[PDB]
Amino acid sequence: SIIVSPRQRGNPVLKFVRNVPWEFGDVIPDYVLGQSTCALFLSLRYHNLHPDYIHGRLQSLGKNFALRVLLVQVDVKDPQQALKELAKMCILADCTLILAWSPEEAGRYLETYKAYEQKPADLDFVSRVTECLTTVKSVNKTDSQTLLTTFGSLEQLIAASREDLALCPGLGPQKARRLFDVLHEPFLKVP
Amino acid sequence: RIAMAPLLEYERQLVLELLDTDGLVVCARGLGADRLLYHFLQLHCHPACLVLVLNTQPAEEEYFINQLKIEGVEHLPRRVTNEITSNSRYEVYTQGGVIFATSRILVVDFLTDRIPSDLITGILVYRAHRIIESCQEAFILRLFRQKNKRGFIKAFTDNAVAFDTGFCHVERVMRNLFVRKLYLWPRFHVAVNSFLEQHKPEVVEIHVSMTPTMLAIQTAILDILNACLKELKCHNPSLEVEDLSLENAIGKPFDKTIRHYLDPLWHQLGAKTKSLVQDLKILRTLLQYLSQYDCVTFLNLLESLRATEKAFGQNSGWLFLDSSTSMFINARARLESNPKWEALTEVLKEIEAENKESEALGGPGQVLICASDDRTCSQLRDYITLGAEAFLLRLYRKTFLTIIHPLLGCSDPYALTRVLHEVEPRYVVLYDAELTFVRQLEIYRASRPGKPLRVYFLIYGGSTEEQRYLTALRKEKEAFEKLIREKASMTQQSIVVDMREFRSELPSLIHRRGIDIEPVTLEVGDYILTPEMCVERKSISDLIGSLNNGRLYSQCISMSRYYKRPVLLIEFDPSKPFSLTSRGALFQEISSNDISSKLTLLTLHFPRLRILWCPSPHATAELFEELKQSKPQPDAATANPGPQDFLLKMPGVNAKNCRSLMHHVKNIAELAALSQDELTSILGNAANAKQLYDFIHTSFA
DNA sequence: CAGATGCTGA
DNA sequence: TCAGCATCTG
């Protein structure tokens, strides 16, 4: 549901998103990630060639959205002067600096900002899976890391039977059996 | 009385010049370096004067304590380490005397405002050759410049070859030590050569030949090494300066230069390059062990394991299976031995005959042999009491006065010096070592009316040890000649820094820019440039550990509740920058499984968060000063249930959401295998469905 | 043959 | 995250 400004016609970042549909519209920000989340693409080469390009845009943007996320991609072999100026501009203004290294990384950043309107449960996928799977028993950090490095996804773990989980050493077959029994057991009664 | 307080005649002139005016003393590879430190420590070993040690070693501290206890000092020097509480250090620093502290605790104790200052006489700097780089030793010297009068600093060093390095000037190291004058006492001096000329022993050099088979083996090894070097240079013309010819590969500073030139290991990843490097290392260690040890252990203990390693896989490379076959014939036929043992036996028999012929009204001498390592010493001790052929047969059938002491090893040289001083020998055998030669020269010059000691030399024809000893002497002479020519050619701000953040290079460079440092204990944050901003620094390795455990969110939610704009700084590396992206999972996942993915959610949940990036520690030091152009100075005084809980932890759920979802579905597999259309139809909000699809469907890479 | 650290309970 | 207990491993 993202809206891309018509000024970003020849942008390679738009050809990297596949899991999120996009559209066009006469909107002031370049990228609108839902609501109160505006993104702005800017490369280091364009900033070095045209120094009076991001200041005017930041001054004309104003204070309309709640949070402003300004992403920048580094391409200079010596990012010691432009990076400091960008950090100073982001500190003086009200925006968040995001460092990128490739257009695919910028597309990944956009797709991540688009679909993270969830609750603040973060109190890498290994950390997320070891925080979301530790609520049930027979799952610790080591077991979560082993299940991530041996399977790679939750579908292959929930699709396997009890005998297919008793071949990994370091956790025992009883722990896997108890985990499967806790997982496949329903909570609500039949009604 | 092992400790000698008086010095020689050539050493009394320096103490008269160093006591009045402070300066840097550079010895000639240990030309009385410790003898001057021990003399200077006794002059300030009083409870009234407080003298702290900059940096020393635990092996020398016990020896110095034993020497001072033997001398009979009324107050023994103490040692402060990380073995007691912080409050217990207030009584040790106030008692007085020489205190042997560490290089890491001295900075924290000085910056924690708990050291009894305004009464310290000075600090003796030992081994000043390590202050060339921006290490933690410079911060102690920078913080010490706080006394108006009676402030002195004495720096001692004995490594003159360390100064002969490109992109490293002597003036930069001299300006970082607050020393104006500079002293020097090389071997080419007149006062040192005139005193050591009347006391010189009689050294006898004996050239030992080699067997013809060993010469052919060395020639084949050199040919294989040259072929490998040519093959490496043909497939890699970039690192041409590191390997100019085959002579540099035989030298010692070869592996260091190779590791320095081949810095981008992840960029030049190649099987052929790694195989050639391993082959070069194997050819080096084999040529070293062939000349260091016997030939039987070269074939039975070295040539046997390499064949099995090559037959097991591609560890040693397959290019050594159909090449250098003649080396397998000369090693198996060797049977014979090396002429070194024969020369040693001949020297021993000559010494025995000389002692027997001069046994009338004369006491014999205790001849001792010196070994490079413990294995060579054990081999020499077992060969004498058994024999040559007997030992050669025993080693082949196993697997299928006159005191020997090693020289190089983990043992401190003080033990070897005490052993050599315990018994006075008459004929000493050396391994062409410069340190042992200097020690023998000093021993002979210390005792004028002593017995004439004879030092024997063992140098093989065209050996690596002789070339190394010649190159080291040439480098030392060049460094001395360069140092002689370089000598003969001459409103403030405050920043609150955490105590636990003093090991980084940021506080060492902050005080150098000119701004002051007002540190104090705290609980949240690391750097505070203004009372309305708090900065915390995270490296490329600590950020992952802080984001996986969850302490980062707790620290961020506890800082924004009181302060205005809490920001953070991320320190990365420009040489090896982490892409933070999965190559094998970017096509099978919805942009997940990344640290940046969690960082985005963290910076989105907290709108008052700024993400800073710096490629080098020199950039953040300037960024912290640029942000204080008009900001005021901060003050120091203001510083059934199972599946329920399983579904509750899922992203994109809520109380009513879970209550409505559990009433429709029963198992988790049905909703896991189903698409997001039904999930967004039964709920309405597509964001939660997208979050669930991104979480439950992802790939690992 | 025998002791190591995450299951069990909240 | 804090008291008892057993799987596979040294």
JSON list of C-alpha atoms in Angstrom, two decimals, chain A:
[
{"chain": "A", "resi": 1, "resn": "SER", "atom": "CA", "xyz": [0.00, 0.00, 0.00]},
{"chain": "A", "resi": 2, "resn": "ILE", "atom": "CA", "xyz": [3.07, 2.22, -0.32]},
{"chain": "A", "resi": 3, "resn": "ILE", "atom": "CA", "xyz": [2.87, 5.31, -2.54]},
{"chain": "A", "resi": 4, "resn": "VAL", "atom": "CA", "xyz": [5.92, 6.26, -4.62]},
{"chain": "A", "resi": 5, "resn": "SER", "atom": "CA", "xyz": [6.37, 9.81, -5.87]},
{"chain": "A", "resi": 6, "resn": "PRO", "atom": "CA", "xyz": [6.65, 10.27, -9.67]},
{"chain": "A", "resi": 7, "resn": "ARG", "atom": "CA", "xyz": [10.10, 11.85, -9.21]},
{"chain": "A", "resi": 8, "resn": "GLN", "atom": "CA", "xyz": [11.59, 8.42, -8.42]},
{"chain": "A", "resi": 9, "resn": "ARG", "atom": "CA", "xyz": [11.04, 7.08, -11.92]},
{"chain": "A", "resi": 10, "resn": "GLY", "atom": "CA", "xyz": [14.51, 5.66, -12.56]},
{"chain": "A", "resi": 11, "resn": "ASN", "atom": "CA", "xyz": [15.04, 4.13, -9.11]},
{"chain": "A", "resi": 12, "resn": "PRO", "atom": "CA", "xyz": [16.47, 0.59, -8.85]},
{"chain": "A", "resi": 13, "resn": "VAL", "atom": "CA", "xyz": [15.01, 0.21, -5.35]},
{"chain": "A", "resi": 14, "resn": "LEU", "atom": "CA", "xyz": [11.47, 0.00, -6.76]},
{"chain": "A", "resi": 15, "resn": "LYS", "atom": "CA", "xyz": [12.44, -3.09, -8.78]},
{"chain": "A", "resi": 16, "resn": "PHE", "atom": "CA", "xyz": [13.51, -4.99, -5.64]},
{"chain": "A", "resi": 17, "resn": "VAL", "atom": "CA", "xyz": [10.21, -5.14, -3.72]},
{"chain": "A", "resi": 18, "resn": "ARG", "atom": "CA", "xyz": [8.00, -8.14, -4.52]},
{"chain": "A", "resi": 19, "resn": "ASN", "atom": "CA", "xyz": [6.10, -8.89, -1.30]},
{"chain": "A", "resi": 20, "resn": "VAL", "atom": "CA", "xyz": [4.54, -5.41, -0.94]},
{"chain": "A", "resi": 21, "resn": "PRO", "atom": "CA", "xyz": [2.40, -3.76, -3.65]},
{"chain": "A", "resi": 22, "resn": "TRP", "atom": "CA", "xyz": [3.02, -0.12, -4.54]},
{"chain": "A", "resi": 23, "resn": "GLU", "atom": "CA", "xyz": [1.10, 2.66, -6.25]},
{"chain": "A", "resi": 24, "resn": "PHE", "atom": "CA", "xyz": [1.50, 6.25, -7.44]},
{"chain": "A", "resi": 25, "resn": "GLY", "atom": "CA", "xyz": [0.07, 9.46, -6.04]},
{"chain": "A", "resi": 26, "resn": "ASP", "atom": "CA", "xyz": [0.63, 13.20, -5.72]},
{"chain": "A", "resi": 27, "resn": "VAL", "atom": "CA", "xyz": [2.08, 13.05, -2.21]},
{"chain": "A", "resi": 28, "resn": "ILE", "atom": "CA", "xyz": [4.78, 15.32, -0.78]},
{"chain": "A", "resi": 29, "resn": "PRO", "atom": "CA", "xyz": [7.01, 12.57, 0.70]},
{"chain": "A", "resi": 30, "resn": "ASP", "atom": "CA", "xyz": [8.71, 10.21, -1.73]},
{"chain": "A", "resi": 31, "resn": "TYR", "atom": "CA", "xyz": [7.71, 7.01, 0.10]},
{"chain": "A", "resi": 32, "resn": "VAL", "atom": "CA", "xyz": [4.69, 6.67, 2.40]},
{"chain": "A", "resi": 33, "resn": "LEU", "atom": "CA", "xyz": [4.92, 3.57, 4.62]},
{"chain": "A", "resi": 34, "resn": "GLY", "atom": "CA", "xyz": [1.34, 3.42, 5.84]},
{"chain": "A", "resi": 35, "resn": "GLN", "atom": "CA", "xyz": [0.65, 6.34, 8.17]},
{"chain": "A", "resi": 36, "resn": "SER", "atom": "CA", "xyz": [2.99, 8.75, 9.99]},
{"chain": "A", "resi": 37, "resn": "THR", "atom": "CA", "xyz": [5.98, 6.92, 8.45]},
{"chain": "A", "resi": 38, "resn": "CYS", "atom": "CA", "xyz": [7.62, 8.77, 5.56]},
{"chain": "A", "resi": 39, "resn": "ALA", "atom": "CA", "xyz": [10.79, 7.57, 3.83]},
{"chain": "A", "resi": 40, "resn": "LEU", "atom": "CA", "xyz": [13.23, 9.48, 1.63]},
{"chain": "A", "resi": 41, "resn": "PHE", "atom": "CA", "xyz": [15.82, 7.87, -0.63]},
{"chain": "A", "resi": 42, "resn": "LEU", "atom": "CA", "xyz": [19.15, 9.64, -1.12]},
{"chain": "A", "resi": 43, "resn": "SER", "atom": "CA", "xyz": [22.54, 8.40, -2.33]},
{"chain": "A", "resi": 44, "resn": "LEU", "atom": "CA", "xyz": [25.97, 9.68, -1.34]},
{"chain": "A", "resi": 45, "resn": "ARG", "atom": "CA", "xyz": [26.94, 10.36, -4.97]},
{"chain": "A", "resi": 46, "resn": "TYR", "atom": "CA", "xyz": [23.95, 12.66, -5.52]},
{"chain": "A", "resi": 47, "resn": "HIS", "atom": "CA", "xyz": [24.71, 14.43, -2.24]},
{"chain": "A", "resi": 48, "resn": "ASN", "atom": "CA", "xyz": [28.37, 14.95, -3.18]},
{"chain": "A", "resi": 49, "resn": "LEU", "atom": "CA", "xyz": [27.45, 16.18, -6.67]},
{"chain": "A", "resi": 50, "resn": "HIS", "atom": "CA", "xyz": [24.57, 18.40, -5.48]},
{"chain": "A", "resi": 51, "resn": "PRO", "atom": "CA", "xyz": [25.16, 19.55, -1.88]},
{"chain": "A", "resi": 52, "resn": "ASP", "atom": "CA", "xyz": [22.14, 21.89, -1.84]},
{"chain": "A", "resi": 53, "resn": "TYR", "atom": "CA", "xyz": [19.64, 19.11, -2.52]},
{"chain": "A", "resi": 54, "resn": "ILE", "atom": "CA", "xyz": [18.71, 17.50, 0.80]},
{"chain": "A", "resi": 55, "resn": "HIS", "atom": "CA", "xyz": [18.63, 20.73, 2.86]},
{"chain": "A", "resi": 56, "resn": "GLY", "atom": "CA", "xyz": [15.92, 22.29, 0.70]},
{"chain": "A", "resi": 57, "resn": "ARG", "atom": "CA", "xyz": [13.85, 19.11, 0.77]},
{"chain": "A", "resi": 58, "resn": "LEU", "atom": "CA", "xyz": [14.17, 18.83, 4.56]},
{"chain": "A", "resi": 59, "resn": "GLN", "atom": "CA", "xyz": [13.19, 22.49, 4.93]},
{"chain": "A", "resi": 60, "resn": "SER", "atom": "CA", "xyz": [10.18, 22.17, 2.62]},
{"chain": "A", "resi": 61, "resn": "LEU", "atom": "CA", "xyz": [9.01, 18.91, 4.22]},
{"chain": "A", "resi": 62, "resn": "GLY", "atom": "CA", "xyz": [8.02, 20.63, 7.46]},
{"chain": "A", "resi": 63, "resn": "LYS", "atom": "CA", "xyz": [6.57, 18.90, 10.52]},
{"chain": "A", "resi": 64, "resn": "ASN", "atom": "CA", "xyz": [3.55, 16.89, 9.36]},
{"chain": "A", "resi": 65, "resn": "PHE", "atom": "CA", "xyz": [4.22, 13.22, 10.17]},
{"chain": "A", "resi": 66, "resn": "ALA", "atom": "CA", "xyz": [4.93, 11.80, 13.61]},
{"chain": "A", "resi": 67, "resn": "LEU", "atom": "CA", "xyz": [8.19, 10.00, 12.78]},
{"chain": "A", "resi": 68, "resn": "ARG", "atom": "CA", "xyz": [10.51, 10.77, 9.86]},
{"chain": "A", "resi": 69, "resn": "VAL", "atom": "CA", "xyz": [12.90, 8.07, 8.62]},
{"chain": "A", "resi": 70, "resn": "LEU", "atom": "CA", "xyz": [15.60, 9.30, 6.22]},
{"chain": "A", "resi": 71, "resn": "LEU", "atom": "CA", "xyz": [17.62, 6.47, 4.67]},
{"chain": "A", "resi": 72, "resn": "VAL", "atom": "CA", "xyz": [20.96, 7.05, 2.92]},
{"chain": "A", "resi": 73, "resn": "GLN", "atom": "CA", "xyz": [23.18, 4.68, 0.94]},
{"chain": "A", "resi": 74, "resn": "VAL", "atom": "CA", "xyz": [26.96, 5.01, 1.26]},
{"chain": "A", "resi": 75, "resn": "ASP", "atom": "CA", "xyz": [28.96, 4.59, -1.95]},
{"chain": "A", "resi": 76, "resn": "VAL", "atom": "CA", "xyz": [32.13, 6.65, -1.37]},
{"chain": "A", "resi": 77, "resn": "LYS", "atom": "CA", "xyz": [35.34, 4.87, -0.38]},
{"chain": "A", "resi": 78, "resn": "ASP", "atom": "CA", "xyz": [36.01, 7.60, 2.23]},
{"chain": "A", "resi": 79, "resn": "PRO", "atom": "CA", "xyz": [32.73, 8.24, 4.11]},
{"chain": "A", "resi": 80, "resn": "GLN", "atom": "CA", "xyz": [34.33, 10.52, 6.71]},
{"chain": "A", "resi": 81, "resn": "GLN", "atom": "CA", "xyz": [33.03, 13.96, 5.64]},
{"chain": "A", "resi": 82, "resn": "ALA", "atom": "CA", "xyz": [29.60, 13.30, 4.12]},
{"chain": "A", "resi": 83, "resn": "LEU", "atom": "CA", "xyz": [28.59, 10.89, 6.90]},
{"chain": "A", "resi": 84, "resn": "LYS", "atom": "CA", "xyz": [29.41, 13.44, 9.61]},
{"chain": "A", "resi": 85, "resn": "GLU", "atom": "CA", "xyz": [27.41, 16.13, 7.80]},
{"chain": "A", "resi": 86, "resn": "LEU", "atom": "CA", "xyz": [24.45, 13.77, 7.40]},
{"chain": "A", "resi": 87, "resn": "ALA", "atom": "CA", "xyz": [24.60, 12.85, 11.09]},
{"chain": "A", "resi": 88, "resn": "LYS", "atom": "CA", "xyz": [24.73, 16.52, 12.08]},
{"chain": "A", "resi": 89, "resn": "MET", "atom": "CA", "xyz": [21.76, 17.30, 9.83]},
{"chain": "A", "resi": 90, "resn": "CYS", "atom": "CA", "xyz": [19.76, 14.40, 11.28]},
{"chain": "A", "resi": 91, "resn": "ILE", "atom": "CA", "xyz": [20.62, 15.52, 14.83]},
{"chain": "A", "resi": 92, "resn": "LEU", "atom": "CA", "xyz": [19.66, 19.15, 14.18]},
{"chain": "A", "resi": 93, "resn": "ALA", "atom": "CA", "xyz": [16.44, 18.22, 12.37]},
{"chain": "A", "resi": 94, "resn": "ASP", "atom": "CA", "xyz": [13.74, 15.75, 13.46]},
{"chain": "A", "resi": 95, "resn": "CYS", "atom": "CA", "xyz": [14.50, 12.59, 11.48]},
{"chain": "A", "resi": 96, "resn": "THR", "atom": "CA", "xyz": [16.11, 9.16, 11.79]},
{"chain": "A", "resi": 97, "resn": "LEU", "atom": "CA", "xyz": [19.26, 8.22, 9.87]},
{"chain": "A", "resi": 98, "resn": "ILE", "atom": "CA", "xyz": [19.39, 4.79, 8.20]},
{"chain": "A", "resi": 99, "resn": "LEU", "atom": "CA", "xyz": [22.63, 3.54, 6.64]},
{"chain": "A", "resi": 100, "resn": "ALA", "atom": "CA", "xyz": [22.39, 1.37, 3.52]},
{"chain": "A", "resi": 101, "resn": "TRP", "atom": "CA", "xyz": [24.97, -0.33, 1.32]},
{"chain": "A", "resi": 102, "resn": "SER", "atom": "CA", "xyz": [22.93, -1.45, -1.71]},
{"chain": "A", "resi": 103, "resn": "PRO", "atom": "CA", "xyz": [19.53, -0.79, -3.33]},
{"chain": "A", "resi": 104, "resn": "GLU", "atom": "CA", "xyz": [18.46, -4.28, -2.23]},
{"chain": "A", "resi": 105, "resn": "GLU", "atom": "CA", "xyz": [19.27, -3.24, 1.34]},
{"chain": "A", "resi": 106, "resn": "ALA", "atom": "CA", "xyz": [17.12, -0.13, 0.92]},
{"chain": "A", "resi": 107, "resn": "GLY", "atom": "CA", "xyz": [14.25, -2.24, -0.40]},
{"chain": "A", "resi": 108, "resn": "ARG", "atom": "CA", "xyz": [14.63, -4.59, 2.55]},
{"chain": "A", "resi": 109, "resn": "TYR", "atom": "CA", "xyz": [14.59, -1.61, 4.92]},
{"chain": "A", "resi": 110, "resn": "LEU", "atom": "CA", "xyz": [11.40, -0.32, 3.28]},
{"chain": "A", "resi": 111, "resn": "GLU", "atom": "CA", "xyz": [9.70, -3.73, 3.43]},
{"chain": "A", "resi": 112, "resn": "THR", "atom": "CA", "xyz": [10.71, -4.03, 7.10]},
{"chain": "A", "resi": 113, "resn": "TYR", "atom": "CA", "xyz": [9.38, -0.58, 7.98]},
{"chain": "A", "resi": 114, "resn": "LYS", "atom": "CA", "xyz": [6.15, -1.35, 6.11]},
{"chain": "A", "resi": 115, "resn": "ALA", "atom": "CA", "xyz": [5.13, -4.51, 8.00]},
{"chain": "A", "resi": 116, "resn": "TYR", "atom": "CA", "xyz": [6.28, -3.81, 11.58]},
{"chain": "A", "resi": 117, "resn": "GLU", "atom": "CA", "xyz": [3.16, -2.23, 13.10]},
{"chain": "A", "resi": 118, "resn": "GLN", "atom": "CA", "xyz": [3.04, -4.97, 15.75]},
{"chain": "A", "resi": 119, "resn": "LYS", "atom": "CA", "xyz": [3.21, -4.64, 19.53]},
{"chain": "A", "resi": 120, "resn": "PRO", "atom": "CA", "xyz": [6.55, -3.92, 21.24]},
{"chain": "A", "resi": 121, "resn": "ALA", "atom": "CA", "xyz": [7.33, -7.56, 22.07]},
{"chain": "A", "resi": 122, "resn": "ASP", "atom": "CA", "xyz": [11.10, -7.10, 21.60]},
{"chain": "A", "resi": 123, "resn": "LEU", "atom": "CA", "xyz": [11.97, -7.12, 25.29]},
{"chain": "A", "resi": 124, "resn": "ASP", "atom": "CA", "xyz": [17.96, -11.10, 13.89]},
{"chain": "A", "resi": 125, "resn": "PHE", "atom": "CA", "xyz": [15.40, -13.90, 13.67]},
{"chain": "A", "resi": 126, "resn": "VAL", "atom": "CA", "xyz": [17.36, -16.02, 16.17]},
{"chain": "A", "resi": 127, "resn": "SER", "atom": "CA", "xyz": [16.62, -13.51, 18.93]},
{"chain": "A", "resi": 128, "resn": "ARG", "atom": "CA", "xyz": [12.99, -13.17, 17.81]},
{"chain": "A", "resi": 129, "resn": "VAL", "atom": "CA", "xyz": [12.48, -16.94, 17.68]},
{"chain": "A", "resi": 130, "resn": "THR", "atom": "CA", "xyz": [14.23, -17.51, 21.03]},
{"chain": "A", "resi": 131, "resn": "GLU", "atom": "CA", "xyz": [12.05, -14.80, 22.60]},
{"chain": "A", "resi": 132, "resn": "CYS", "atom": "CA", "xyz": [8.79, -16.05, 21.07]},
{"chain": "A", "resi": 133, "resn": "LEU", "atom": "CA", "xyz": [9.47, -19.77, 21.60]},
{"chain": "A", "resi": 134, "resn": "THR", "atom": "CA", "xyz": [10.77, -19.49, 25.18]},
{"chain": "A", "resi": 135, "resn": "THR", "atom": "CA", "xyz": [7.19, -19.06, 26.42]},
{"chain": "A", "resi": 136, "resn": "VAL", "atom": "CA", "xyz": [6.68, -22.81, 26.00]},
{"chain": "A", "resi": 137, "resn": "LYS", "atom": "CA", "xyz": [8.78, -25.46, 27.71]},
{"chain": "A", "resi": 138, "resn": "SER", "atom": "CA", "xyz": [11.50, -27.70, 26.24]},
{"chain": "A", "resi": 139, "resn": "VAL", "atom": "CA", "xyz": [12.83, -24.66, 24.33]},
{"chain": "A", "resi": 140, "resn": "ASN", "atom": "CA", "xyz": [15.91, -22.67, 25.40]},
{"chain": "A", "resi": 141, "resn": "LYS", "atom": "CA", "xyz": [18.44, -20.49, 23.57]},
{"chain": "A", "resi": 142, "resn": "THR", "atom": "CA", "xyz": [20.60, -23.47, 22.57]},
{"chain": "A", "resi": 143, "resn": "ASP", "atom": "CA", "xyz": [17.60, -25.54, 21.45]},
{"chain": "A", "resi": 144, "resn": "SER", "atom": "CA", "xyz": [16.24, -22.58, 19.47]},
{"chain": "A", "resi": 145, "resn": "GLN", "atom": "CA", "xyz": [19.61, -22.02, 17.79]},
{"chain": "A", "resi": 146, "resn": "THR", "atom": "CA", "xyz": [19.86, -25.73, 16.94]},
{"chain": "A", "resi": 147, "resn": "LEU", "atom": "CA", "xyz": [16.33, -25.82, 15.51]},
{"chain": "A", "resi": 148, "resn": "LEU", "atom": "CA", "xyz": [17.10, -22.71, 13.45]},
{"chain": "A", "resi": 149, "resn": "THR", "atom": "CA", "xyz": [20.41, -24.04, 12.11]},
{"chain": "A", "resi": 150, "resn": "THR", "atom": "CA", "xyz": [18.99, -27.52, 11.39]},
{"chain": "A", "resi": 151, "resn": "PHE", "atom": "CA", "xyz": [15.59, -26.62, 9.88]},
{"chain": "A", "resi": 152, "resn": "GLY", "atom": "CA", "xyz": [15.52, -22.91, 9.03]},
{"chain": "A", "resi": 153, "resn": "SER", "atom": "CA", "xyz": [11.76, -22.43, 9.35]},
{"chain": "A", "resi": 154, "resn": "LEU", "atom": "CA", "xyz": [8.86, -23.22, 11.67]},
{"chain": "A", "resi": 155, "resn": "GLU", "atom": "CA", "xyz": [6.89, -25.05, 8.97]},
{"chain": "A", "resi": 156, "resn": "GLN", "atom": "CA", "xyz": [9.47, -27.84, 8.69]},
{"chain": "A", "resi": 157, "resn": "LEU", "atom": "CA", "xyz": [9.45, -28.12, 12.49]},
{"chain": "A", "resi": 158, "resn": "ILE", "atom": "CA", "xyz": [5.66, -28.30, 12.91]},
{"chain": "A", "resi": 159, "resn": "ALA", "atom": "CA", "xyz": [5.33, -30.66, 9.92]},
{"chain": "A", "resi": 160, "resn": "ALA", "atom": "CA", "xyz": [7.76, -33.29, 11.23]},
{"chain": "A", "resi": 161, "resn": "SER", "atom": "CA", "xyz": [6.58, -36.13, 13.46]},
{"chain": "A", "resi": 162, "resn": "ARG", "atom": "CA", "xyz": [7.92, -37.19, 16.86]},
{"chain": "A", "resi": 163, "resn": "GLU", "atom": "CA", "xyz": [10.46, -39.61, 15.37]},
{"chain": "A", "resi": 164, "resn": "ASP", "atom": "CA", "xyz": [11.90, -36.91, 13.10]},
{"chain": "A", "resi": 165, "resn": "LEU", "atom": "CA", "xyz": [12.76, -34.73, 16.13]},
{"chain": "A", "resi": 166, "resn": "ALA", "atom": "CA", "xyz": [14.62, -37.43, 18.11]},
{"chain": "A", "resi": 167, "resn": "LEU", "atom": "CA", "xyz": [17.66, -37.53, 15.80]},
{"chain": "A", "resi": 168, "resn": "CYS", "atom": "CA", "xyz": [19.29, -34.23, 16.84]},
{"chain": "A", "resi": 169, "resn": "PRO", "atom": "CA", "xyz": [21.80, -34.74, 19.68]},
{"chain": "A", "resi": 170, "resn": "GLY", "atom": "CA", "xyz": [22.15, -32.35, 22.60]},
{"chain": "A", "resi": 171, "resn": "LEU", "atom": "CA", "xyz": [18.47, -32.10, 23.58]},
{"chain": "A", "resi": 172, "resn": "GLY", "atom": "CA", "xyz": [17.25, -35.68, 24.06]},
{"chain": "A", "resi": 173, "resn": "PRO", "atom": "CA", "xyz": [14.13, -37.31, 22.62]},
{"chain": "A", "resi": 174, "resn": "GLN", "atom": "CA", "xyz": [12.03, -36.77, 25.74]},
{"chain": "A", "resi": 175, "resn": "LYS", "atom": "CA", "xyz": [12.31, -32.98, 25.49]},
{"chain": "A", "resi": 176, "resn": "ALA", "atom": "CA", "xyz": [11.27, -33.04, 21.82]},
{"chain": "A", "resi": 177, "resn": "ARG", "atom": "CA", "xyz": [8.35, -35.35, 22.64]},
{"chain": "A", "resi": 178, "resn": "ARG", "atom": "CA", "xyz": [7.18, -33.05, 25.43]},
{"chain": "A", "resi": 179, "resn": "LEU", "atom": "CA", "xyz": [7.53, -30.01, 23.16]},
{"chain": "A", "resi": 180, "resn": "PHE", "atom": "CA", "xyz": [5.46, -31.69, 20.44]},
{"chain": "A", "resi": 181, "resn": "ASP", "atom": "CA", "xyz": [2.83, -32.76, 22.99]},
{"chain": "A", "resi": 182, "resn": "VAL", "atom": "CA", "xyz": [2.56, -29.19, 24.28]},
{"chain": "A", "resi": 183, "resn": "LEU", "atom": "CA", "xyz": [2.45, -27.79, 20.73]},
{"chain": "A", "resi": 184, "resn": "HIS", "atom": "CA", "xyz": [-0.13, -30.00, 19.02]},
{"chain": "A", "resi": 185, "resn": "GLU", "atom": "CA", "xyz": [-2.43, -30.07, 22.07]},
{"chain": "A", "resi": 186, "resn": "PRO", "atom": "CA", "xyz": [-5.35, -27.64, 21.64]},
{"chain": "A", "resi": 187, "resn": "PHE", "atom": "CA", "xyz": [-6.28, -25.12, 24.31]},
{"chain": "A", "resi": 188, "resn": "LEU", "atom": "CA", "xyz": [-9.98, -24.50, 23.64]},
{"chain": "A", "resi": 189, "resn": "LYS", "atom": "CA", "xyz": [-12.49, -27.28, 24.16]},
{"chain": "A", "resi": 190, "resn": "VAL", "atom": "CA", "xyz": [-14.56, -28.84, 21.39]},
{"chain": "A", "resi": 191, "resn": "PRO", "atom": "CA", "xyz": [-17.73, -26.78, 20.94]}
]
